[PDB]
Paper text:
Most kinases in this group, including those in the mammalian Ste20-like (MST) kinase family, are Thr selective (Miller et al., 2008), while members of the p21-activated kinase (PAK) family are Ser selective (Rennefahrt et al., 2007). Here we show that a residue located in the kinase activation segment, which we term the “DFG+1” residue, acts as a major determinant for serine-threonine phosphorylation site specificity. To understand the structural basis for how the DFG+1 residue controls phosphoacceptor specificity, we determined the X-ray cocrystal structures of WT and F461V mutant PAK4 catalytic domains in complex with consensus peptide substrates incorporating both their favored and disfavored phosphorylation site residues (PAKtide-S and PAKtide-T). As previously observed for WT PAK4 in the absence of bound peptide (Eswaran et al., 2007; Ha et al., 2012), in each of the structures PAK4 is observed in the active state conformation with the activation loop phosphorylated on residue Ser474.
The DFG+1 Phe residue in these WT PAK4 structures is positioned within 4Å of the Ser phosphoacceptor β-carbon and oriented perpendicular to the substrate peptide backbone. This conformation for the DFG+1 Phe would preclude the additional methyl group of a Thr phosphoacceptor due to steric hindrance. Indeed, in the structure of WT PAK4 in complex with PAKtide-T, the bound peptide is in a nearly identical conformation. However, to accommodate the Thr phosphoacceptor residue, the DFG+1 Phe undergoes significant conformational movement: it rotates ∼75° about its β-γ bond to allow the face of the Phe aromatic ring to interact with the Thr methyl group. This conformation for the DFG+1 residue likely interferes with positioning of the γ-phosphate of ATP. Consistent with the kinetic data, the structure does not suggest impaired PAKtide-T binding to the WT kinase. Rather, decreased phosphorylation of Thr substrates may occur due to conformational effects within the catalytic center. Taken together, these structures provide a likely explanation for why WT PAK4, and by extension other kinases with a DFG+1 Phe residue, is selective for Ser at the phosphorylation site.
Residue numbers in the entry:
A (entry chain A): 300 to 589
B (entry chain B): -3 to 5
Write the structure that this text describes.
Amino acid sequence: SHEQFRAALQLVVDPGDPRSYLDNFIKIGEGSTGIVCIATVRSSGKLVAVKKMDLRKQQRRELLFNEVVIMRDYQHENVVEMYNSYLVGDELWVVMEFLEGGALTDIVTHTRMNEEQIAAVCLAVLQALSVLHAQGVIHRDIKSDSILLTHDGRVKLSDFGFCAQVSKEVPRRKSLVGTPYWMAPELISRLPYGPEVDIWSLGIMVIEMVDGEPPYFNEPPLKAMKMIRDNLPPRLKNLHKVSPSLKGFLDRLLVRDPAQRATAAELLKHPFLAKAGPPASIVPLMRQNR
Amino acid sequence: RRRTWYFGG
């Protein structure tokens, strides 16, 4: 049955073994579904990233097909580019763009972002989401760990292993999927849900960028989920430090009723995003610069 | 904890 799943994934990935062209694998990261390495392309010396996911270590194996559907169908300027996929022994390897700036997590846990920088992140993220949600794709795991940066401060959404599609025949999803602290209240309540859940998770990421941590982060997962399910929307620890503009923005995201929550398309017009700086404005936040 | 969960369906 492992062997049965290996055969199925083989029909879907590219033929071959990229070790035939990559050198010097160095692990740089751990994800929910596997690990991430830098590799050197031997013909040219360029760097790529390689995501390795052990078919035996998955919560749900069939979610590994997510990486193939996104790669094949849903590329965009603010989405990490995937080049090729391979089955190597017991692992799916995806060779992808290397985002040398690392994850937004390393930033929010170590410095303070100003509002120009927060607005730049939110705009980049909302551009990816407007396009994905127009095609019925819901990411379902928006949080700082899923946002990667280039060396020159461009922002890209990554980590689509848990995404799902909605459509006229399947207008909503029912799976309990996400990282507890960032999960939308309707998703925790087990109400069927749609793209609106990424909007709520993005609002929690805005709290990450202001406070450094999502709400209830010191509470065990389950307890945090109960409180998200049952309490009023969570508040910034530092409400006093955010502009009225940023506050009114967040109030469009952390709306408990999914019907009243802003859509990505609507949030691209919010006046808070007018503060968005260029990618250069993100650069000084990165570990090699701060 | 920052780990993603999957349990529904």
